[PDB]
Amino acid sequence: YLPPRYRGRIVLTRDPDGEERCVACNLCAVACPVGCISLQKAETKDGRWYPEFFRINFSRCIFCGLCEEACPTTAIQLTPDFEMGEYKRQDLVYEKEDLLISGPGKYPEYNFYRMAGMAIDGKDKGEAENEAKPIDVKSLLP
Amino acid sequence: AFELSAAEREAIEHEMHHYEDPRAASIEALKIVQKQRGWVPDGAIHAIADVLGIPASDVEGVATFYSQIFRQPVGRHVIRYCDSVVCHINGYQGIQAALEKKLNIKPGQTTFDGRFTLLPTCCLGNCDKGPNMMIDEDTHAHLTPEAIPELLERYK
Amino acid sequence: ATEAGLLGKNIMGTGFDFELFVHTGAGRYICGEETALINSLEGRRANPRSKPPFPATSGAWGKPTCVNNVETLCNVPAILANGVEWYQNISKSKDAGTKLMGFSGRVKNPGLWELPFGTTAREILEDYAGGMRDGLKFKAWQPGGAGT
Amino acid sequence: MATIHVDGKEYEVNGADNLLEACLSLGLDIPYFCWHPALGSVGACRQCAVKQYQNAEDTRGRLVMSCMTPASDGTFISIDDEEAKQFRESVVEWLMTNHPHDCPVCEEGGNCHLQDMTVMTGHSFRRYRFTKRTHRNQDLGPFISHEMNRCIACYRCVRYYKDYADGTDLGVYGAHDNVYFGRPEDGTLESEFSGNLVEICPTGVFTDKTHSERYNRKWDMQFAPSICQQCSIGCNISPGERYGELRRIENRYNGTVNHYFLCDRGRFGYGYVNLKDRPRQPVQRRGDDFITLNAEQAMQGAADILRQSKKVIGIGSPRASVESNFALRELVGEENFYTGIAHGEQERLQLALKVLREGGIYTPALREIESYDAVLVLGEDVTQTGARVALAVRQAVKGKAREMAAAQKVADWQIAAILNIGQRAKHPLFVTNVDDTRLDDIAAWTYRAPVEDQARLGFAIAHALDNSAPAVDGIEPELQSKIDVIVQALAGAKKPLIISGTNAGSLEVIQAAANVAKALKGRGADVGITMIARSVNSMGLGIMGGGSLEEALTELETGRADAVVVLENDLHRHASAIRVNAALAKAPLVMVVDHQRTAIMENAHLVLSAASFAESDGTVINNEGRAQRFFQVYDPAYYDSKTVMLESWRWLHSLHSTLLSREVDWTQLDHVIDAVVAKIPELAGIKDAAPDATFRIRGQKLAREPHRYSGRTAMRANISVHEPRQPQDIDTMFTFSMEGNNQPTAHRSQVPFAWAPGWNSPQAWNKFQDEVGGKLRFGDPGVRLFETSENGLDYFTSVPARFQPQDGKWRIAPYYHLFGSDELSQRAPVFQSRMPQPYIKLNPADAAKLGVNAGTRVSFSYDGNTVTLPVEIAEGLTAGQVGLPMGMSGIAPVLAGAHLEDLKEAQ
Ligand SMILES: Cc1cc2nc3c(=O)[nH]c(=O)nc-3n(C[C@H](O)[C@H](O)[C@H](O)COP(=O)(O)O)c2cc1C
Ligand code: SF4
Ligand code: SF4
Ligand code: SF4
Ligand code: SF4
Numbered sequence A: 001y002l003p004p005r006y007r008g009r010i011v012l013t014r015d016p017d018g019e020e021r022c023v024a025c026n027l028c029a030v031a032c033p034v035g036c037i038s039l040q041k042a043e044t045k046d047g048r049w050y051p052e053f054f055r056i057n058f059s060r061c062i063f064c065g066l067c068e069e070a071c072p073t074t075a076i077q078l079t080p081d082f083e084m085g086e087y088k089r090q091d092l093v094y095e096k097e098d099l100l101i102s103g104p105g106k107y108p109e110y111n112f113y114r115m116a117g118m119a120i121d122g123k124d125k126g127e128a129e130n131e132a133k134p135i136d137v138k139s140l141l142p
Numbered sequence B: 001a002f003e004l005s006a007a008e009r010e011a012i013e014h015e016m017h018h019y020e021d022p023r024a025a026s027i028e029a030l031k032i033v034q035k036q037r038g039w040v041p042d043g044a045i046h047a048i049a050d051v052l053g054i055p056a057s058d059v060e061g062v063a064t065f066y067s068q069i070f071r072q073p074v075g076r077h078v079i080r081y082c083d084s085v086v087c088h089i090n091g092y093q094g095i096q097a098a099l100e101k102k103l104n105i106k107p108g109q110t111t112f113d114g115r116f117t118l119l120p121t122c123c124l125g126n127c128d129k130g131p132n133m134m135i136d137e138d139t140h141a142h143l144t145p146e147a148i149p150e151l152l153e154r155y156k
Numbered sequence C: 001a002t003e004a005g006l007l008g009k010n011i012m013g014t015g016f017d018f019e020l021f022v023h024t025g026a027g028r029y030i031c032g033e034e035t036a037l038i039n040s041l042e043g044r045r046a047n048p049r050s051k052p053p054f055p056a057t058s059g060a061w062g063k064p065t066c067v068n069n070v071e072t073l074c075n076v077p078a079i080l081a082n083g084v085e086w087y088q089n090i091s092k093s094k095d096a097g098t099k100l101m102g103f104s105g106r107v108k109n110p111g112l113w114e115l116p117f118g119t120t121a122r123e124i125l126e127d128y129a130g131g132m133r134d135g136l137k138f139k140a141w142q143p144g145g146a147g148t
Numbered sequence D: 001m002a003t004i005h006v007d008g009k010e011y012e013v014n015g016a017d018n019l020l021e022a023c024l025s026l027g028l029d030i031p032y033f034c035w036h037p038a039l040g041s042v043g044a045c046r047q048c049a050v051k052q053y054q055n056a057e058d059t060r061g062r063l064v065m066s067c068m069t070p071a072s073d074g075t076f077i078s079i080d081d082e083e084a085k086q087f088r089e090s091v092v093e094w095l096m097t098n099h100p101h102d103c104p105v106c107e108e109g110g111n112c113h114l115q116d117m118t119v120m121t122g123h124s125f126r127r128y129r130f131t132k133r134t135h136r137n138q139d140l141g142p143f144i145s146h147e148m149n150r151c152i153a154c155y156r157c158v159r160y161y162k163d164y165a166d167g168t169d170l171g172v173y174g175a176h177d178n179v180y181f182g183r184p185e186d187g188t189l190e191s192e193f194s195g196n197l198v199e200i201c202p203t204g205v206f207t208d209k210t211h212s213e214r215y216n217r218k219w220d221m222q223f224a225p226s227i228c229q230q231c232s233i234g235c236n237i238s239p240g241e242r243y244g245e246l247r248r249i250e251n252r253y254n255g256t257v258n259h260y261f262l263c264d265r266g267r268f269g270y271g272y273v274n275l276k277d278r279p280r281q282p283v284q285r286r287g288d289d290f291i292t293l294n295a296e297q298a299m300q301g302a303a304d305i306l307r308q309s310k311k312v313i314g315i316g317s318p319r320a321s322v323e324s325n326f327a328l329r330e331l332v333g334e335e336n337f338y339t340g341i342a343h344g345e346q347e348r349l350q351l352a353l354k355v356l357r358e359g360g361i362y363t364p365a366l367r368e369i370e371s372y373d374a375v376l377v378l379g380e381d382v383t384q385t386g387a388r389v390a391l392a393v394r395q396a397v398k399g400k401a402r403e404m405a406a407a408q409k410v411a412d413w414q415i416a417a418i419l420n421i422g423q424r425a426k427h428p429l430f431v432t433n434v435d436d437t438r439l440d441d442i443a444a445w446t447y448r449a450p451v452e453d454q455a456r457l458g459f460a461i462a463h464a465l466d467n468s469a470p471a472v473d474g475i476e477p478e479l480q481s482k483i484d485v486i487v488q489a490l491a492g493a494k495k496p497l498i499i500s501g502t503n504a505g506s507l508e509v510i511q512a513a514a515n516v517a518k519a520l521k522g523r524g525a526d527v528g529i530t531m532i533a534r535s536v537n538s539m540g541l542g543i544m545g546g547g548s549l550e551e552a553l554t555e556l557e558t559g560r561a562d563a564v565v566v567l568e569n570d571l572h573r574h575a576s577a578i579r580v581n582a583a584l585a586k587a588p589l590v591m592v593v594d595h596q597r598t599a600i601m602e603n604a605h606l607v608l609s610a611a612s613f614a615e616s617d618g619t620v621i622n623n624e625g626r627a628q629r630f631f632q633v634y635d636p637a638y639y640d641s642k643t644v645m646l647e648s649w650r651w652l653h654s655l656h657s658t659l660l661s662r663e664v665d666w667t668q669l670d671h672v673i674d675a676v677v678a679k680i681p682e683l684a685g686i687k688d689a690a691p692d693a694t695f696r697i698r699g700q701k702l703a704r705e706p707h708r709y710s711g712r713t714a715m716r717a718n719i720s721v722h723e724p725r726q727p728q729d730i731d732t733m734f735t736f737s738m739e740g741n742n743q744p745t746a747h748r749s750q751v752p753f754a755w756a757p758g759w760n761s762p763q764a765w766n767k768f769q770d771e772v773g774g775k776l777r778f779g780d781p782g783v784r785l786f787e788t789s790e791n792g793l794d795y796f797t798s799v800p801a802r803f804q805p806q807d808g809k810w811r812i813a814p815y816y817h818l819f820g821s822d823e824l825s826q827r828a829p830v831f832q833s834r835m836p837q838p839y840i841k842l843n844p845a846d847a848a849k850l851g852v853n854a855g856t857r858v859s860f861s862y863d864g865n866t867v868t869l870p871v872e873i874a875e876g877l878t879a880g881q882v883g884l885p886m887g888m889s890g891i892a893p894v895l896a897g898a899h900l901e902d903l904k905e906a907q
């Protein structure tokens, strides 16, 4: 039996539309006291920021959860699962394919791009939350 | 394919004599071009700029700033109804509602045939004489909703 | 007036040469602000300017400039033709001369009347403007336009 | 000068300054957006609000703006007044109503002035529940991305671009809360100084597009103080590295040289460092096969063949450091050392050096240029070569409006009042070129003519200033009228500036400019002279000396030189390609020490993996003569263990010791600099350019990384989970880590990056200066090698004859481009689209005689080769001339002043 807030294995989650939630903002990497996160930003032709690589060194990780609370997209979360063990320390280094799970985890509904002003596919300018339509300077109305 | 006409060009250079700087003629140059064509097209911005000897971003800055200088195509007759405070007390909202029934548009939009464009405007300086509107250079005062169809018929 | 010799060069035989112009605006309310009128006259976006300096020293095209309202300038011929003493003794009040005062709204007689300073607002409303229209009560009044 | 009372305390400040720049100099934090130290005060954002009292007893005063308020004697202000604090919080609250929720995906994040001021006011709670305004974006070209939603309408971008930088294609549009900052239509920003907008804009509207391809936050960067390598001006820069690749280029404040601004070639021309084609290991040829060697093997292998050779010659480079050329000179001997530039380019460079050292006329620094009252530019297309001088000359031309305003008692910081008083009045600027320049919008007169005609106008100005100067017979009355206009402005100036350079390709233009400066010096004027050179260490290589590259090629093809050690030089730019490739095939041993892949390394026998400026240390000497040190940014061996990239001076010194005593010597940087000072007296100042590797701030080494640097136990964890040791720096005072010092008040001149608590943006440079917009607190880095000589020169009497066209022979008129003419930066992929198509420019009468129009491909012959180019039409180009783009792929800069024997339509 584990409580919901248990600080075991670190995963990266997904949007309800099915895209990866991480926007490679590097706040989780800097807020970690042990320095166990390395990542690089990439950008799609759509314009969506996403991580080119995501690397967590689980030999160094102390499972403090400061990365989860730093994340402004709810992408990185700590799950109730302590079942880890390896013969080699090199196999404690997890890449993005070992971390990205198929769903949204603890926060089923939050999508960051719906908040964001930046324009990606499916959300042009004025299609975000509390956002009006763009008015051109050449418009006849004063 | 904009070209400055030989009479528009002479009218712009006529008003450059009345100032120290040719930059000062920029407002009148935009109104000269708009008077002939209904609105100031996009190619007129670079055209006016090279005549006056100022950059095009200065000309475009002036034209977007001033409300009456138009940078979008309008109708043959522009309807400008007052929506300020004294006209609000005298019943402009009934005039606006009558204009939206006869024309079947909303303010800022042109009619489907392109005869009329409907625009709100500030106080026309005719506050004592009732609700006010302008069609082109003509001022009509003491407006009533019943008078709206007969008034519009004059402008074809 | 240009063909009666009241404008142009050598006005009335004196050395004074004055040339008057009319230039129409493009429709922004901030152009009535006096430093933003100077920028609009110069052919710029009509931002205001910071004072100091004043336009009396640095105004239009960096030249000494004075900006005056139409009704201020119309008082000036009355003063010089009749005298400084006539203008002072029009009203026994701390504000000299006559003013264009009026009432607008849902009143019986909206209009404009030249009146001296120190005329009370009730006199304008009830004797000149004829009071409110019938079936209307008086709630509030703005004395001098929309900014007051 | 003045004493003011702030929050009960009392301070001494300069009376001429306003209250924002007074209080920021004392370390009092006032928030601000629309003010800039370079741009002046306009009063737009209303963020700098303080409460001002009439005297000490006035308890209830008024809110003023400190950027718009003079710091007069007797001023009583309160920054921490409750009503002032609430209003300053409200200004941030009003700006936060329309701001997008974009900080995770904003490239300004962590380096954002709006983020810093929002925290500094203490506004953290949103009350506004309504909709936000949105804007569409524009395309601004390959360098700058556009996101208008983040704009706070501070007007800094337009005030920099139109007022300061004199760009024409950026403005403000619209009105009320719908104001839009940008271009009238999409397209590339035309200004050569567009890239300073990324530092000038306090938000993320204008951001670096070259950095957003490989983005990282500021705290993850590794910084070093470096010098720009793209031309001779010597702008101080702060390059940042992450994961072994150079990421962005930042401006490094230097109050003597560049201060807040860089040019676009410096800011965006760094991409050649990040090429995959660069050599990373030493490579030795075996017939057709290639063998990879380590550092020890390469030195023992090279010195075995070098011991058996009968004569070894050395070819230096103008783009190599002073320590690298000297080490090459020490290895072959000074009798066998060649400079690597052509003889005609060498002759113009030593004459340019002669007038600076022996002319007796002071040569101003880049910021001192802005104080001069008249500027004559002879031959140097200065916007395309030496672009920051053109920015400095624009500010000098605005000094006339500052003089008029000072007479009317308008303060120096009230910029909109000064500009209104001015009204297109300018200090006189006279430029001469072969065609139109980018300074033509502000120039009093432009003179388009061939280079001998430009020199002949220069000698005639000197003869009209002094009777003892030699005269130019044959001047027509039309030109004679204009010469009198220039002479009356020059003689009537209190402080004239004379600008020329080596890029015109004429010895006579440089001779004409020294005659004008001499004639003004005899009149009593405080005259300055400025010469622009070609490369980053052109002046340093000229002080060292040596024979020309043509002499070196002679010693190869006449059999006497058995071996040649080429150092960081692609010889095709300086000499004919067919001659170079033939003479390098006769040599038994060719050795190249370059960081870039060049064409001459195909047949070379040994290539050494030299380091670029990002991976090296050294001293460069700029056009002024200032020796400046550049420091290594990152160790390239840390990420890739097979990388054997050493400094050029470290490779050549070790090779000399293995040649002498068979033992390699990997020397330290201060031993090489000490060796320079002993042998060359003219380079004695380089010791004092920077301190040595034993310099400490109270026992601490200067830090390269910010204290919040991340990923220490995960950066290299994909190769080995065991953390490697941190790279150790024995050359310089800097450490390859964050465990060091970067305090704003630390007693040093070399500042790798600016950061302060509560100031994460480029506005943190105010904490590192003595007064804001002034000099660095403990002095700007760099030392002048030579002082002004007591006595001057004689008048040059070598007046050229007037230019005459010839049938068949066509003179080559040089055209330069900021994004194409420089050797390293044209290999950047972002510069491939910013550079124009290759062309050939002709007079309309000469194209009518040839029978061609615009766009026709025409063929010509240079040195027995054939190049076909499309024709362009140039009305200002005089007949008999032919415009070529210098320094491109195919057109060497040695071609300036050459002749084209044959020209006909291509078939
Ligand atoms: C927003 C604003 C709008 C103004 N509009 C006008 C105007 O339309 N007409 C006018 O005479 N003064 C206007 N003013 C006042 C002028 O700035 C200035 O005080 C006046 O023209 C001075 O002339 P006077 O001495 O004759 O009154 C306006 C002021 C402000 C702040
Ligand atoms: S996991 Fe969260 S905090 Fe870390 S980079 Fe991705 S979005 Fe940013
Ligand atoms: S849980 Fe703590 S130690 Fe582990 S990655 Fe997150 S911040 Fe670093
Ligand atoms: S400009 Fe600054 S405040 Fe605005 S989204 Fe970018 S980082 Fe955040
Ligand atoms: S674009 Fe940037 S610099 Fe220009 S007004 Fe907006 S926030 Fe200020």
Ligand code: SF4
Pocket (backbone or CB within 6 Å): D228, D229, D230, D231, D232, D233, D234, D235, D262, D263, D264, D265, D266, D267, D386, D387, D388, D389
């Ligand atoms: S002016 Fe020269 S040194 Fe300065 S940034 Fe531009 S290219 Fe670099």
Ligand code: FES
Pocket (backbone or CB within 6 Å): B082, B083, B084, B085, B086, B087, B088, B122, B123, B124, B125, B126, B127, B128, B131, B132
């Ligand atoms: S308020 Fe309507 S015209 Fe004045």
Ligand code: FES
Pocket (backbone or CB within 6 Å): D031, D032, D033, D034, D035, D042, D043, D044, D045, D046, D047, D048, D065, D066, D067, D068
């Ligand atoms: S910084 Fe002073 S008002 Fe903007």
Ligand SMILES: [Ca+2]
Pocket (backbone or CB within 6 Å): D615, D616, D617, D632, D647, D731
């Ligand atoms: Ca080193």
